[PDB]
Amino acid sequence: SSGIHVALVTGGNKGIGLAIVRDLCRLFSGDVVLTARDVTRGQAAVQQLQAEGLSPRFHQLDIDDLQSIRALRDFLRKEYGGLDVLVNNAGIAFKVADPTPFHIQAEVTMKTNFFGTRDVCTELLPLIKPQGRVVNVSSIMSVRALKSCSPELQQKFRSETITEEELVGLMNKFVEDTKKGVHQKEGWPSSAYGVTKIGVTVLSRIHARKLSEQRKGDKILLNACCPGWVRTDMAGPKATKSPEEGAETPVYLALLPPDAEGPHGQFVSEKRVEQW
Amino acid sequence: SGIHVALVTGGNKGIGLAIVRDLCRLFSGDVVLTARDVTRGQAAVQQLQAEGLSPRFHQLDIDDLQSIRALRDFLRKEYGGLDVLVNNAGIAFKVADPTPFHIQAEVTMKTNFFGTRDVCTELLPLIKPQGRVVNVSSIMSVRALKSCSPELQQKFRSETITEEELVGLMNKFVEDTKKGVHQKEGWPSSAYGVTKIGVTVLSRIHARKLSEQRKGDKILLNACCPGWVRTDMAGPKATKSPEEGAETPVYLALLPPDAEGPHGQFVSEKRVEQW
Numbered sequence: 001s002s003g004i005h006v007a008l009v010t011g012g013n014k015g016i017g018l019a020i021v022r023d024l025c026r027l028f029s030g031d032v033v034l035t036a037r038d039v040t041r042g043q044a045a046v047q048q049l050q051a052e053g054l055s056p057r058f059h060q061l062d063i064d065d066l067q068s069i070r071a072l073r074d075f076l077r078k079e080y081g082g083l084d085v086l087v088n089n090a091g092i093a094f095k096v097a098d099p100t101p102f103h104i105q106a107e108v109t110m111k112t113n114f115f116g117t118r119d120v121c122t123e124l125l126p127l128i129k130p131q132g133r134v135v136n137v138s139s140i141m142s143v144r145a146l147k148s149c150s151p152e153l154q155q156k157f158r159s160e161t162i163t164e165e166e167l168v169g170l171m172n173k174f175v176e177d178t179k180k181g182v183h184q185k186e187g188w189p190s191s192a193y194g195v196t197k198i199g200v201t202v203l204s205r206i207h208a209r210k211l212s213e214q215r216k217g218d219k220i221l222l223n224a225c226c227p228g229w230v231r232t233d234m235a236g237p238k239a240t241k242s243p244e245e246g247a248e249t250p251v252y253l254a255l256l257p258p259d260a261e262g263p264h265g266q267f268v269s270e271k272r273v274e275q276w
Numbered sequence: 277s278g279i280h281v282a283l284v285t286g287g288n289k290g291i292g293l294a295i296v297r298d299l300c301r302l303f304s305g306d307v308v309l310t311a312r313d314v315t316r317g318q319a320a321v322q323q324l325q326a327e328g329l330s331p332r333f334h335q336l337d338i339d340d341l342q343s344i345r346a347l348r349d350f351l352r353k354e355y356g357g358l359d360v361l362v363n364n365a366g367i368a369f370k371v372a373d374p375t376p377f378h379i380q381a382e383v384t385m386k387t388n389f390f391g392t393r394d395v396c397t398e399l400l401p402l403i404k405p406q407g408r409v410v411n412v413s414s415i416m417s418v419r420a421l422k423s424c425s426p427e428l429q430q431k432f433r434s435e436t437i438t439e440e441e442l443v444g445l446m447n448k449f450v451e452d453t454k455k456g457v458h459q460k461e462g463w464p465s466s467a468y469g470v471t472k473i474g475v476t477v478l479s480r481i482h483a484r485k486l487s488e489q490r491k492g493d494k495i496l497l498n499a500c501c502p503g504w505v506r507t508d509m510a511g512p513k514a515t516k517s518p519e520e521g522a523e524t525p526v527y528l529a530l531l532p533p534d535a536e537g538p539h540g541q542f543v544s545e546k547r548v549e550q551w
């Protein structure tokens with residue numbers, strides 16, 4: 001199927017991810033792959049969409065399991081010879097008043113939101129075809145968390161020259177510092193979720209740079225984004241946006257017209273660049 | 277007299293960690309272990325601390341000019357300069373890695389040559405009288421050199437080559453691989469090898485500049501091969517342990533005060549080799 005354009009969404013069985021799959025089914029000229037970690041919930045979501053007259057393909061994917069990521073990589077390489085659109089939407093959050101010890105929240109949330117997302121990029125970024133787009137769903141909480149970090153930490157996270165390996169070290173340091181009970185003293189903010197989304201936002205900046213230096217001329221665009229405050233199982237019902245509204249900026253970034261030079265490596269909210 | 281300081285890049289594992297261990301034992305003063313990952317770096321320091329050694333730590337990623345410059349500023353403030361610099365940090369793709377060759381060339385060159393070059397640009401001005409600088413190259417540089425066209429060999433063996441000419445040739449290799457013309461343009465097959473030609477020739481150039489600019493300060497700078505060493509880079513079939521691998525770099529870093537040489541040499545098993 002190498003001649004067919006293909007778009008893929010992670011965490012696509014519910015919430016924002018499902019809304020993105022719906023929009024891409026309608027707007028993307030090619031195949032759309034809904035992925036989910038639970039094959040039973042994934043296939044049920046597909047069946048549900050079929051009842052709305054939409055036909056995304058399905059493939060299992062748990063971003064915490066490197067063998068799951070590699071199986072998907074091999075599938076795409078085999079069927080499509082690559083990938084045109086990748087939406088990294090999968091993510092988790094503990095409740096604001098969750099009693100789980102903070103260092104556990106830090107470790108678990110970082111494991112999925114940062115390391116899982118990073119592993120998907122490691123394995124799938126090489127497969128992105130020319131004119132392809134990559135969208136990492138972050139959060140405006142990443143900016144709030146950034147501004148709540150020590151000046152030392154802010155300088156590192158805003159750097160234009162930070163490397164993936166430096167970022168990995170800083171993300172692991174946050175998790176270790178919470179375990180040692182010293183995260184406040186070491187300059188970190190109080191939202192584990194927020195810090196993991198700093199990782200996502202900064203990883204996007206790093207990867208956009210890497211694309212510009214390794215794939216000049218291939219016209220690939222990669223950005224981080226915030227979907228806004230969306231009524232899903234994550235945020236609950238007090239939120240102001242429907243999932244369909246939440247999907248608007250991610251879809252915009254996925255479908256940027258061919259030959260666009262930007263936005264690239266930007267943090268985007270309501271289709272506009274936010275200063276990092 | 278006063279405080280002396282020695283610093284190793286890529287010190288958290290492999291040959292670098294072994295060099296740090298040796299320097300902690302043999303170098304009187306502070307020995308700074310640096311690593312790009314602060315978590316791995318501090319774990320490495322803890323490991324040495326369990327052994328009775330007391331290395332200092334500072335973050336350093338040689339791909340990040342701001343990281344290099346932060347280290348430069350730290351060294352100036354804390355020590356007023358640097359006595360020993362070991363440029364050990366390096367990467368290699370596997371022999372059978374499926375990554376496109378032109379990407380292997382770009383990524384390997386970015387670290388091994390350009391990163392090493394940036395550390396030298398920023399830290400060489402800080403080297404104190406009787407200081408020593410050791411650039412960890414590889415015998416793969418000689419093997420790569422001998423695999424270049426006669427015309428390229430002439431350029432790389434030149435006693436008059438400039439840093440800027442060498443930069444242009446390293447960038448030319450990376451460009452030629454992307455264009456799919458590197459073999460025709462006279463380049464060898466090992467990207468890693470070509471990056472270490474860069475390291476070896478940069479060392480010759482910098483020794484020459486030290487002699488021009490800072491004669492009388494008795495600084496010695498050399499390239500070396502640690503040999504074939506069992507690390508995450510080479511694997512378990514290699515013939516040397518990391519401690520054995522550290523022997524030549526440590527010998528070059530600790531050359532006695534006032535020694536006239538070696539300087540600007542490529543050294544292996546503590547012996548000067550022909551370039």
Ligand SMILES: NC(=O)C1=CN([C@@H]2O[C@H](COP(=O)(O)OP(=O)(O)OC[C@H]3O[C@@H](n4cnc5c(N)ncnc54)[C@H](OP(=O)(O)O)[C@@H]3O)[C@@H](O)[C@H]2O)C=CC1
Nearest residue numbers: 011015016037062063089090091139229230232233234235
């Ligand atoms: N206000 C909001 O809702 C905001 C949300 N976000 C971000 O939007 C994205 C989507 O969140 P939202 O739709 O709200 O949340 P939901 O909880 O409703 O959906 C999250 C999706 O991610 C999946 N997921 C979680 N972990 C994994 C993993 N290990 N592997 C594969 N899939 C996984 C879930 O699968 P499963 O059903 O199996 O649990 C689910 O499909 C997240 O990244 C979130 O951080 C950002 C800003 C605001």
Ligand SMILES: NC(=O)C1=CN([C@@H]2O[C@H](COP(=O)(O)OP(=O)(O)OC[C@H]3O[C@@H](n4cnc5c(N)ncnc54)[C@H](OP(=O)(O)O)[C@@H]3O)[C@@H](O)[C@H]2O)C=CC1
Nearest residue numbers: 286290291312337338364365366414504505507508509510
């Ligand atoms: N092993 C061998 O047979 C030989 C090795 N060499 C050279 O010896 C040196 C050490 O290699 P070896 O110990 O085998 O390799 P290892 O992979 O075991 O260790 C390499 C070290 O370099 C660090 N490093 C890599 N890139 C960077 C960077 N961007 N910034 C800071 N540190 C970095 C690594 O950090 P991290 O842990 O974060 O990756 C690690 O500490 C290299 O220059 C290599 O080319 C030369 C001849 C033979």
Ligand SMILES: N[C@@H](CCC(=O)N[C@@H](CS)C(=O)NCC(=O)O)C(=O)O
Nearest residue numbers: 093094095096139191192193234235
């Ligand atoms: N205790 C958690 C709180 C995380 C959190 O912010 N939770 C949810 C409420 S459960 C959220 O919806 N955040 C979404 C966003 O706006 O990005 C932590 O420190 O990580």
Ligand SMILES: N[C@@H](CCC(=O)N[C@@H](CS)C(=O)NCC(=O)O)C(=O)O
Nearest residue numbers: 368369370371414466467468509510
């Ligand atoms: N595909 C690579 C291969 C690099 C390579 O030679 N391998 C490393 C990995 S096995 C090594 O261990 N030897 C290093 C040395 O002897 O200096 C390239 O062309 O650069």
